[PDB]
Amino acid sequence: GKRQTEREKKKKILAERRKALAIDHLNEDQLREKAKELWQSIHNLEAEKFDLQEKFKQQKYEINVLRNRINDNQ
Amino acid sequence: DDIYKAAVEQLTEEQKNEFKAAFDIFVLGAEDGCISTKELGKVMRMLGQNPTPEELQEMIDEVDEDGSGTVDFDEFLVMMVRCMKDDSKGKSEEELSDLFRMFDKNADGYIDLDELKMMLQATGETITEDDIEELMKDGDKNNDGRIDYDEFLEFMKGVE
Amino acid sequence: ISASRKLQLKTLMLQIAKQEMEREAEERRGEKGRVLRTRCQPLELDGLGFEELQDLCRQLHARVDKVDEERYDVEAKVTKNITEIADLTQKIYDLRGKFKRPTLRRVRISADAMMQAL
Amino acid sequence: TTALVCDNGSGLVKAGFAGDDAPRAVFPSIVGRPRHQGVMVGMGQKDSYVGDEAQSKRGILTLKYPIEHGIITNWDDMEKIWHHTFYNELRVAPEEHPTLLTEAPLNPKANREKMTQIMFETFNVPAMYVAIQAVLSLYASGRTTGIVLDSGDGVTHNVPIYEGYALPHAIMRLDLAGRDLTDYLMKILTERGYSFVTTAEREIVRDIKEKLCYVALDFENEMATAASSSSLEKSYELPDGQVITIGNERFRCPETLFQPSFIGMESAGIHETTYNSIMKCDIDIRKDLYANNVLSGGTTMYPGIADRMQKEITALAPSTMKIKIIAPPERKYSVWIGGSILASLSTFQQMWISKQEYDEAGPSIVHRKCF
Amino acid sequence: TTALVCDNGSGLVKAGFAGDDAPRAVFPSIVGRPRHQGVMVGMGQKDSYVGDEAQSKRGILTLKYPIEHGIITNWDDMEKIWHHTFYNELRVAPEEHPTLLTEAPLNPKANREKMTQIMFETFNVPAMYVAIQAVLSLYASGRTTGIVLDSGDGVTHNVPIYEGYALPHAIMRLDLAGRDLTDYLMKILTERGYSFVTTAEREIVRDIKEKLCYVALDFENEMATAASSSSLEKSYELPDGQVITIGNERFRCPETLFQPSFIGMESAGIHETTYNSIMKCDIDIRKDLYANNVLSGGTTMYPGIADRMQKEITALAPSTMKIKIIAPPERKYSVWIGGSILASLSTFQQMWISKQEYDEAGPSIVHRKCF
């Protein structure tokens, strides 16, 4: 399905579609505020990816159950 | 056990009217309840319940243990109410899936009937003849050596 | 076979289920907090000059980009394998529930109670 | 809320709420104006008795079906029938209930569009959906493949389906059905002396057909036996006495299904249009269709048809394939049971034609994606 | 860890872990979208059935091979086939396994480069290596010399090898293979009345070819015998009955290999392109190539080909040389067995195209030293 489209989608979310921005060009208090904000956002992303790994484990367990049911079903 | 005693305590009046209609129909004057299992089954059918012919046979074969036909309305009505379904589907299949996710300590896509025994023992519960044997027999009912997820479902499906 | 046996078994099963539910929930909360702490390193209110502020700010901007790319990548993996899991769910249902589909009915309920209509 | 699974049919309107086992109200679809003058004053005489009320006063009415062959020929009468069905037989206002009508295959478009326009403007339902009468009968059997022969009272159609993918180029619709069998029976009864002419006496002939006629396993042997012995002559009591005796008219009336040359129709019987419908399908799904032949509809209730049809198809089909004919005991209401099952599905809940969609595209919405 | 020895082929994808005797999963490489409409709701109908699943639902699909003649013409479908092979037939994620694809000789570069780019970007393997399909078939025979005729289903190629030194100027690649024989058989069956047209019925004709056809030792004598007696007519039962009888179509279908003028191809048969491939070699290694002629590939499984080919070459070759034709019973999987042996070698363990190397030079790395 034009894996070129999938590759470009991945790369845009990698560089363009993700909230990427040069910001360390500001005054003191504002720079600290922005650093805190970005660090907290990425921390929330840490929580999100921790749950991503958790649910991926769950899906692996579910596919284990899936294969088990398959083998028991034939 | 205590479940039937509690159900007796929490007698639903909507079903109570049906049971007293059964009392009126079967009792023919100071009648001590000779247990006409055919009458009981026809009463169950009339009152809107749908007892199986297998349930009808069970009620035939699980009565008059006194041997005198006349039976205390206590145990009779316990049998009548429990034969009638009073529950909501016995939990949810998604709930059961998550519970099995908890219970797969073996982490092999299934649990074990031996694992079931170990967990129930860890719960510190009484194991007896009514326990122990048929518990694990019906947990791995297909007898695969371990309790698959669907086996865990079918062990206790539709039960509160 | 006594159904009181099943009643007691379900009491114990419900107890085990609730205990394991709370246990896994608490485990997840604690491990999640631990991972966030060891990964979301704190940002400090003092000790850095303006130049140090800028330096650490851009360093953490780079770190933010690193972890953002990593988590977006693993998120994409989660999504794709989730699509796969959904497909397998459909397939296994077709394996098992294809013939169980018509079985769902709620029937012979009211018409049985309509003999006085005529 | 709950959905209304109506099923117009032609001869019996079957309706009821979705999720049950049997239709709540089943009544003939006839609207009969009185024809005599009427002398009693204040008797409360209405101008049109519809439904089952006109099967009791049929002595002084002129019953006329509003649906001829699947298609609807008299829209005012059909509207009256629907109004009766909603308000008096179910007593649920249509403003609060989705509806699921049913329609024969290969019917004129204008019929379907007018049906949806009526349901949305006059009765003002929230959302309605039209489904082909054979897919439902396949739902009710719990299958997912098979070729279903739905011989109703208006029209007999034969829709083959495989793995859920209908084959639109293999639908064989034939217009011989129960009504033509009633007319042919009424026409051959005249060979003994019994003359039924009035539109009210067509109902009596229909009752005779339902209670006495049966499909012969072998036609020539039965014709020879009925012409020598007298073990077949079954008698029947008219609504006023004067019992009648039906001889070899018993199995000659429903034989028209397998030899439509009796009523002058050219086409081949229901035993050969099924084989032709199969042979138009692809070469790799013919075994499954052979093994899962489904019967439905009222007219397939004749005693002994599930054996005659199997014998005929086994004669036509290759000797290796296994021919099996599914004939559930709940044949008459099979379409409605399937309709209830389909309306009760969660996956189907977003296929209804919502009213705002109709307001935006007009009645021609039914031919669009929401089929 | 263990290596994945995949073998795309054209007609059957054969895969399995390195170090075994037979491929773990063998299934046709076809991807078929449904073509009819589909009326059952919630049946769980997918949009494309690949592999062996589409050989069971082929009655309502339009199967289309993603590999025409060695080359790959439809990259999305090929990616789908690879994804199925990795995840459902072997159930091993590719992130932890080297892969060893196989490719016909003299194929377009872009095909190979796209193959490696897909394997490194989409599936993200650790390291992949592409090998010529004939060297593996020579591995499996346990030889080190010999000229191998690998008549697959897509393309027939004839690579001579001596003492491990391949002769690149003597490779004779011919595009007649099993698929053209299937089409020619389907075209000559029409001379008796049997018409197969649909892309699904091509599979039935392929089954007929596999089970009935054989290569005649002498063509004219067989043509004369089949035209007088009737000892050759073998019957076969279609997927629905109606047995068919194949007469002299039995040995006329695979005769196309030795006379490509039947399907209009100009070139000489597989009996003469081998001799030409030998004669291009040097004068001192012709005896060894004569004595070690190797057969491989699926299409060389016709009963009686190892004798016809030997007779033909003995007719062409000088009378003194000994002509021997190696035809192992495990012909079909010979390429994959050789691939397993090659992947299991310790000396070969440093020839893989490591991912960091691809990152530094791009997909054009495959033409470089890591061949």
Ligand SMILES: Nc1ncnc2c1ncn2[C@@H]1O[C@H](COP(=O)(O)OP(=O)(O)O)[C@@H](O)[C@H]1O
């Ligand atoms: N028990 C029966 N035996 C023979 N024929 C019957 C029987 N019941 C109904 N029929 C015929 O079938 C017709 C009813 O068919 P039905 O399935 O109601 O049509 P529709 O598809 O319009 O609902 C009646 O007109 C009658 O002629």
Ligand SMILES: Nc1ncnc2c1ncn2[C@@H]1O[C@H](COP(=O)(O)OP(=O)(O)O)[C@@H](O)[C@H]1O
């Ligand atoms: N037993 C057999 N007899 C005759 N022909 C066969 C037989 N098995 C396979 N073939 C032909 O060989 C083809 C398979 O060849 P194969 O070696 O799988 O090709 P590839 O090199 O692409 O793997 C099939 O299309 C079929 O036409």
Ligand SMILES: [Mg+2]
């Ligand atoms: Mg009908």
Ligand SMILES: [Mg+2]
């Ligand atoms: Mg090959």
